[PDB]
Amino acid sequence: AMTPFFWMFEEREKMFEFYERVSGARMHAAYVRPGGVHQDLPLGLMDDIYEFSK
């Protein structure tokens, strides 16, 4: 099947915009740490999560 791969990877590439705005690299992040969470969510992201989920 060719279509369901490319149908979701458009949406999946939008998902790494959340990762880039919350941490340095695209995929792997040193974000979850023994001290909880390394860095707080920026002001732009919290409005984007609701916009994505809709």
Added chain:
Amino acid sequence: XXXXXXXXXXXXXXXXXXXXXXXXXXGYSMFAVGIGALLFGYWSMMKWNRERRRLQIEDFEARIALMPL
């Protein structure tokens, strides 16, 4: 003043909603159009073959008419 990330939900995006529903086709109604197209198909086709018979006999008549050939 402290400024942090604010919470917003508004519509909650609707948690698990069905989008798949029956459209256009019902069941019995599709067979009325399906087999209905077949019955219309044969009746239209066979009338042309009867019109072909008008040409057919007339074509073979040319051979009988031509004896100097």
